[PDB]
Amino acid sequence: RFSPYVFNGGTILAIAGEDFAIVASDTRLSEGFSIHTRDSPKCYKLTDKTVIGCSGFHGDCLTLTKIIEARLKMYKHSNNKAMTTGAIAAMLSTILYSRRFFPYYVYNIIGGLDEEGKGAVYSFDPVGSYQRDSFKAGGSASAMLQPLLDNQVGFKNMQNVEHVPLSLDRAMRLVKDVFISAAERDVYTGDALRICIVTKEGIREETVSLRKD
Amino acid sequence: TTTLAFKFRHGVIVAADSRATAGAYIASQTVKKVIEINPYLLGTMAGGAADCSFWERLLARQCRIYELRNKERISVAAASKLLANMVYQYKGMGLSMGTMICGWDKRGPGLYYVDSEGNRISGATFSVGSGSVYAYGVMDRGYSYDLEVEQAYDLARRAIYQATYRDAYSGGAVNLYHVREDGWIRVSSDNVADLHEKYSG
Amino acid sequence: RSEYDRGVNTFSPEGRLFQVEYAIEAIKLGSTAIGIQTSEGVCLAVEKRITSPLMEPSSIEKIVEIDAHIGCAMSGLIADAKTLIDKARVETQNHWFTYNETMTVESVTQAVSNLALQFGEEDADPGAMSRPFGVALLFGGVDEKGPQLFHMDPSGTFVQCDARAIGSASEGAQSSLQEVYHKSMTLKEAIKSSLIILKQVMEEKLNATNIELATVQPGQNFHMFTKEELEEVIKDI
Amino acid sequence: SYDRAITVFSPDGHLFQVEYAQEAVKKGSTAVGVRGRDIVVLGVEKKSVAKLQDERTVRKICALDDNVCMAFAGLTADARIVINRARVECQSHRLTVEDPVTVEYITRYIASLKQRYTQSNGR
Amino acid sequence: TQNPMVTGTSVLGVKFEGGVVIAADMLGSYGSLARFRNISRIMRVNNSTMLGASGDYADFQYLKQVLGQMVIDEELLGDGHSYSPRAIHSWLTRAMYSRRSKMNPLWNTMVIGGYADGESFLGYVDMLGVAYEAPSLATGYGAYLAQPLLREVLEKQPVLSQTEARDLVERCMRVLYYRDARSYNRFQIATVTEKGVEIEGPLSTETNWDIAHMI
Amino acid sequence: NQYDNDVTVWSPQGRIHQIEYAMEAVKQGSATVGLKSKTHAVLVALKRAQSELAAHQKKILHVDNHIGISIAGLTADARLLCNFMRQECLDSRFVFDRPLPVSRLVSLIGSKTQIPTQRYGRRPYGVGLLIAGYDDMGPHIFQTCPSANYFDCRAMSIGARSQSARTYLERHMSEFMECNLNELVKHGLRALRETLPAEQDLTTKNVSIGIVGKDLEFTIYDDDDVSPFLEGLEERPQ
Amino acid sequence: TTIMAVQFDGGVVLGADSRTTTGSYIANRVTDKLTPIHDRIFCCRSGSAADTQAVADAVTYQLGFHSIELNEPPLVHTAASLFKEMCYRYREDLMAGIIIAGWDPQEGGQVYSVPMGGMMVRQSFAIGGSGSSYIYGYVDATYREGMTKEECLQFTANALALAMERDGSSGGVIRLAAIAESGVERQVLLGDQIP
Amino acid sequence: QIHSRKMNVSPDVNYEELARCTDDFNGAQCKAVCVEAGMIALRRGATELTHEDYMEGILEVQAKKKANLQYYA
Amino acid sequence: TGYDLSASTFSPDGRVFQVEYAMKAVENSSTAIGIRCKDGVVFGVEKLVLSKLYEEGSNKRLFNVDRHVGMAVAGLLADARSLADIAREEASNFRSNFGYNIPLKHLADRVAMYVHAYTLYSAVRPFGCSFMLGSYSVNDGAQLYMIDPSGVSYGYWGCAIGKARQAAKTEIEKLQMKEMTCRDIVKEVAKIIYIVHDEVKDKAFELELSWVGELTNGRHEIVPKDIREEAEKYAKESLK
Ligand SMILES: CC(C)C[C@@H](C=O)NC(=O)[C@H](CC(C)C)NC(=O)[C@H](CC(C)C)NC(=O)OCc1ccccc1
Ligand SMILES: CC(C)C[C@@H](C=O)NC(=O)[C@H](CC(C)C)NC(=O)[C@H](CC(C)C)NC(=O)OCc1ccccc1
């Protein structure tokens, strides 16, 4: 029979520092055991201060990304202002919930500077369940990446250690290292790392190579 | 996960754990399972996270319109009836939510239990969730209508902490909320690990 | 007029739309409401014009709360104002529900105007609003931009006004407002100015029962029902 | 402008057909009401006994719910329709919200039913 | 289409400097039987775009009718605006996603190749609505039996001249013929270039059966 | 005239009065001027104020990055029409992932306006527009009428006191294609100044300037944003 | 059950068996599978008796209105397109495979095969039904370009006869129709062409 | 134009546009638009009559009168 | 007359005035002339430039109904653009269901039915535009039809719609349309338009020329630029 969903793979990560938000994703579209493409970056920049990462069935990821963009324009005409990162998170929860009985198989992490200018990460379940978080990783390799951020950005399980604030330089290094290790043990993760840094000046994209096996 | 609500002489005490789990994996340990519907109304949530968050938010919106239109804050019984009616329409469609709507109104301290199955009941003490069974035992042994306010908080903190120890899907900091005539107050949020040293000794 | 006023459907040989102008006339039957927007906040003042001693003062609602940050004053048909006021109250809450944020005063005025515009769309809820609404609403609120006051009219047209008057004696009030209003006016200075203008343009003496006052400022919430301070401010002036 | 048409306005600004409806209320028998500290009371007049006519059927004062009662002045049949609709809403309010209808709500409901007839022609 | 009836097999696409080449067997198979042996699975949409389809032919014939009517309709307007290859890819993705949501899918995997404004476009549209733009593309069994040859050559040399790319496609088509049961030795090759879309006629590939002698 | 009652009734003189009356509604609105260079299209409008304390009314609206509109005639119809334009543009960016051709939008705006003209029950739309946009084939300025007729115009002015602007445009139409953006704007406001009564003059508050270009998304400049274009203006001719 | 069409230069020869079967019972041993859609267009139907009878009657009604409306003899390509549109639209609902073969002045004798999907292909020879699988070799072996009507009539009778013998579903009588500018000549072969 | 020949009309004035505006006008009314336009320019002290002054004459002749009405701006 | 107001109401004599009032607006429109040469049909429209601000090609009165079929419209353009859309849809559905390009005779009958329907109902005014449809097919040859605002359609070897329909038809009769080659016919169409232009009354005008035929391979393309320029030169010399 027709099966409405397929797992196209992919992993997304967002780390939010005081003045920066880093949304990074692997760039492999994978169907079954075959690789559909080695360059399909998940990160999509919805607004100057907001980047969303969508991993799961690609058709669902593509449709949601178009719906979010159409709705950001609809709001800009209506309110004469851009949706703020928290508002984009709230709107996403409602859209995901509308298809509660036919779920969008998309894991979404929204990362951007907030109205104060502090980095904010909102993590969503497939039917919409956002919680503001300092760090979150979602996708096929979500389980492998999340614990390291807890150990180092979180400083969890650590005694007699200074809780120094995360620096943008250190954060980029953690983003690459979690992904480089993830490619080693995840069949669905590898190829390239697209990293987006949301800063007051604006989003910047950096690509780091990962194992192509 | 684990939510407990009891109405003692000095107001109603609502406390909940902070854990959300996707299957075995813990999605988060910082979840907020109490929704502040109004300054005098708090609704706790258990069961599917998405279903509870949207439906309680919908009640919160429905109540603010009722406050603006009728010029009087909604009753706890009306609030429970509204949530129960909305959930009943979607019955057999897989909605999963268990909630307690608690507030101080004209009638008095009020605590209500609303279920996705359509069960709306009122009671002095209720615990809803995976760790509800554990919370009920410790709360039931040691619940007094005449409990002192500081003592009532300690029974609530312990009941969630003991429930977290037995329940795998129950864990995280315990959020303590006091609903009184003046209005709700967030007494404190304490991580189970810190409580484990103090309570165990 | 001279015919062509039978429906908003018909157009005048001059090209004017009658019926829309007739609804603009209905606002004049309303009691005067004066709103002044200042950096400290927006002040709304109204003439209650209580018909009888027996009737309860609260039932006449000339100033109503759309939301904590937004307050509205209505001059014109009472029933028509209620339909528009309900839409603004549902919309502010729906914008909160969908976007987890407080709607701007301009956006509420725009949303209400959209229903007001449908005098005869012929597609929306057929059998509803076959005629233009007869109420002019002054929306005073503090939003992210700051204190803002917006005037909507029966034709769906809305504008931001530093100071505005609606209802009977609106024309007299506006002329007085241009002389009194200045950019640096404090909310307190504006509140005194609004009642002074209201006293001159109302036949009855400005006793506390006669005038209802409202003020929205960034620090506080709606606070638009000054109570017993209606007596205090009036006596000082 | 024109008196005949509920929706046509007037150059002065008046929906005359609505005002013509108020005349029927004035021609109705007098009814009075007072608000008492514990005994709200409504009074009615013109029993107007007609000799061979039973007066149980004439019911100018009709209760809507246990906590709320109403007295109508105007066309008798139109009143019967409004009273019944208000009676249904009072019970429905209890089904939608398990709390008795506040008096303001039933008056707002009666006002809304009355406004809906005013809004369009054909009613 | 809940159940596919007559289905085409793999379609191969490789971009080349100045254009794209798409190759598809002229066969329609009802299960094992190759019922139709002279069927074109490549369509010309406009003068800068071409489409190759795998899967139920009846669904492709319908898509060909709908896509063609859209091009004729834009031509009637004649306002100097014509759909780009990327725009055809988007419409196919939206149509395929909408069909999936209705639970009545179009059973086809499609490759859209075009050269517009100096840029080649190669795109894949799945029945589910998965869509990506890639340097090389293969559908059905071909992604397993052809894209590996294409990827190695394309990675080693990023830009392939038209002759080299046409040679690669013929080489892969032979590999599909030998190892795909649904394949037929009567492929057709379409090339999009600034000159336009040209669909070559029945072609066949020389086959070496020498391995048979050595057990 | 008993033949003037409805848009569904033909005059015995072969005219439809209701449609012509709707065009008169456009005249009552303030003047709006649009001119196009080879690379940029600019719409400049005069904003009237209902009350001195009240802010000036919006005259220019943003349909999309590629399209912008100027309003003349009923504000009520303009908001209804602008909403149709915004929906059509966003749908094009969704269904086809291409900025909608401005010419194709104008045809769609025209098709909707004809249905009120041909059938009873809705007033013929009473708003005239000056669409300005950059598409694949270059800058386009289009004007629309309640009659459902759309005209591609190198430069046009619709509204009260428009003829003075159209005459300046007729004399200056040839130099418009090669002029730079600052010159194209200076010409456009100069056309608007002719519409103004002699006592009134262009001010940052009363003028709205909207520019859509090959390198510029449609941008509305108002208040201080209008000031660079306003400054350096030729002194008003006396 | 077994249906076949061959296109000679001046026309088409269409033939089929006469068996309608429920399980292993023959409901009709003498079935006219070939039906006249129009004066010079015929369709041979295979699959479900009810579905085929309905779509054929529906097309006959639509084509008849089109021909009177346009005052011209109907082209075979339109007749095939009407059958194809119905089959594709109601693919899940209908279980019918049709061979639309007819003579049209504009394009001459032509044979169109609509498989159950609703796909349409113009074929020099098309064979359909349960028996078709059995005679696929003879059809692609004994077909020679430019066969005369008499040769095509012999080919159809022989190919259908070979399939009828192998297929239990197909059997009985062979119904043969030749369509040309002159018109249609219908012959019934009482199981001839025995090999 | 025939009546305005004596008056100092500006070259800018376009008679065709004015004629299109003056639908259903008798010839005497067309003369009236010209006569009134001359007085309207005299009221503002204008040396020459602009097209807009002629448009004002059309309104005065029709007795229509003009003002901003809102629901328009 | 009182009875003139409704399209649904017949006059006492037995005619509908509303249908007649539509035709008079068609008469007020600028003339469009179409001549059926043996190799296809050539259409020319006396489009009138107004203001001069409008860019060339604005308010075109020649439209493509289908690749083969072409239409020339005289009357309110807005009504014509609607009719063109109705015809484009009918052609779309015909290729869509019947599978072959629409026969011009059938497309004309269908568009005429849409125009006819408007006449019988009070809610909708009858269409105020008259149009002619021309196409070339190998099977049917060149075909030309004209549909009036009352939805009446009949074949014409040559026809003109607009203010100068009578004047142009007299000039059209002189041409040997039955055997004339289309390339020569285009030049004649330019001359016929130039004779009926009444340029002093109409001020400026732009000639629009449309061609469908064996030369065009059954495509209703606008006559290529320069071919029109020669026709304009031939007409200008003939005028003087
Ligand atoms: C916020 C609280 C109400 C959540 C709380 C209640 O028990 N704890 C939980 O663990 C809940 C309940 C679960 C065991 C069914 N967990 C969940 O709801 C988890 C993860 C959350 C972060 C969204 N979600 C989940 O398992 O699947 C939900 C779903 C349902 C339909 C489609 C797609 C996804
Ligand atoms: C068009 C016919 C002349 C072809 C005929 C061949 O024997 N086909 C059939 O007869 C098909 C069998 C087929 C599915 C193999 N069977 C039938 O049509 C018979 C009815 C008999 C009284 C004739 N059964 C039937 O229609 O009911 C069950 C059914 C319903 C729908 C589809 C297929 C089968």
PDB file of C-alpha atoms and ligand atoms in Angstrom, chain A residues 100 103 125-127 129 131, chain B residues 1 19-23 27 31 33 45-49 52, ligand 1:
ATOM      1  CA  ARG A 100      -2.281  16.492  14.576  1.00  0.00           C
ATOM      2  CA  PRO A 103       1.445  14.407  11.544  1.00  0.00           C
ATOM      3  CA  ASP A 125       8.283  17.519  18.712  1.00  0.00           C
ATOM      4  CA  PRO A 126       6.525  16.463  15.440  1.00  0.00           C
ATOM      5  CA  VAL A 127       3.064  17.746  16.696  1.00  0.00           C
ATOM      6  CA  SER A 129       5.951  21.092  21.851  1.00  0.00           C
ATOM      7  CA  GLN A 131      10.596  24.550  25.181  1.00  0.00           C
TER       8      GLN A 131
ATOM      9  CA  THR B   1       4.518  12.212  34.550  1.00  0.00           C
ATOM     10  CA  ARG B  19      10.617  15.478  32.639  1.00  0.00           C
ATOM     11  CA  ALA B  20       9.396  14.778  29.080  1.00  0.00           C
ATOM     12  CA  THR B  21      10.374  11.458  27.456  1.00  0.00           C
ATOM     13  CA  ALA B  22      10.270  10.465  23.765  1.00  0.00           C
ATOM     14  CA  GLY B  23       9.903   6.704  24.179  1.00  0.00           C
ATOM     15  CA  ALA B  27      13.440  14.710  25.690  1.00  0.00           C
ATOM     16  CA  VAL B  31       9.453  20.969  31.173  1.00  0.00           C
ATOM     17  CA  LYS B  33       3.749  21.103  33.525  1.00  0.00           C
ATOM     18  CA  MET B  45      -0.709  18.820  32.623  1.00  0.00           C
ATOM     19  CA  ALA B  46       0.159  15.122  32.126  1.00  0.00           C
ATOM     20  CA  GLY B  47      -0.097  12.724  29.141  1.00  0.00           C
ATOM     21  CA  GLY B  48       0.840  13.728  25.592  1.00  0.00           C
ATOM     22  CA  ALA B  49       2.791  17.000  25.843  1.00  0.00           C
ATOM     23  CA  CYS B  52      -2.029  19.263  26.887  1.00  0.00           C
TER      24      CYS B  52
HETATM   25  C1  LIG J   1       4.628  18.242  29.136  1.00  0.00           C
HETATM   26  C2  LIG J   1       4.049  16.965  29.722  1.00  0.00           C
HETATM   27  C3  LIG J   1       2.536  16.979  29.538  1.00  0.00           C
HETATM   28  C4  LIG J   1       4.713  15.734  29.118  1.00  0.00           C
HETATM   29  C5  LIG J   1       4.885  14.610  30.134  1.00  0.00           C
HETATM   30  C6  LIG J   1       3.600  13.915  30.548  1.00  0.00           C
HETATM   31  O1  LIG J   1       3.628  12.782  30.887  1.00  0.00           O
HETATM   32  N1  LIG J   1       5.908  13.616  29.861  1.00  0.00           N
HETATM   33  C7  LIG J   1       6.116  12.780  28.689  1.00  0.00           C
HETATM   34  O2  LIG J   1       7.024  12.033  28.734  1.00  0.00           O
HETATM   35  C8  LIG J   1       5.285  12.798  27.412  1.00  0.00           C
HETATM   36  C9  LIG J   1       4.252  11.674  27.445  1.00  0.00           C
HETATM   37  C10 LIG J   1       4.613  10.426  26.648  1.00  0.00           C
HETATM   38  C11 LIG J   1       5.240   9.350  27.527  1.00  0.00           C
HETATM   39  C12 LIG J   1       3.385   9.895  25.916  1.00  0.00           C
HETATM   40  N2  LIG J   1       6.223  12.661  26.314  1.00  0.00           N
HETATM   41  C13 LIG J   1       5.944  13.165  24.984  1.00  0.00           C
HETATM   42  O3  LIG J   1       4.909  13.685  24.748  1.00  0.00           O
HETATM   43  C14 LIG J   1       6.984  12.993  23.882  1.00  0.00           C
HETATM   44  C15 LIG J   1       8.108  14.035  23.918  1.00  0.00           C
HETATM   45  C16 LIG J   1       7.713  15.455  24.320  1.00  0.00           C
HETATM   46  C17 LIG J   1       8.938  16.348  24.434  1.00  0.00           C
HETATM   47  C18 LIG J   1       6.794  16.092  23.292  1.00  0.00           C
HETATM   48  N3  LIG J   1       6.357  12.914  22.579  1.00  0.00           N
HETATM   49  C19 LIG J   1       6.048  11.613  22.023  1.00  0.00           C
HETATM   50  O4  LIG J   1       6.409  10.632  22.576  1.00  0.00           O
HETATM   51  O5  LIG J   1       5.322  11.510  20.836  1.00  0.00           O
HETATM   52  C20 LIG J   1       4.308  12.464  20.719  1.00  0.00           C
HETATM   53  C21 LIG J   1       3.782  12.415  19.289  1.00  0.00           C
HETATM   54  C22 LIG J   1       2.450  12.109  19.061  1.00  0.00           C
HETATM   55  C23 LIG J   1       1.963  12.062  17.766  1.00  0.00           C
HETATM   56  C24 LIG J   1       2.816  12.320  16.706  1.00  0.00           C
HETATM   57  C25 LIG J   1       4.147  12.627  16.934  1.00  0.00           C
HETATM   58  C26 LIG J   1       4.633  12.673  18.229  1.00  0.00           C
END
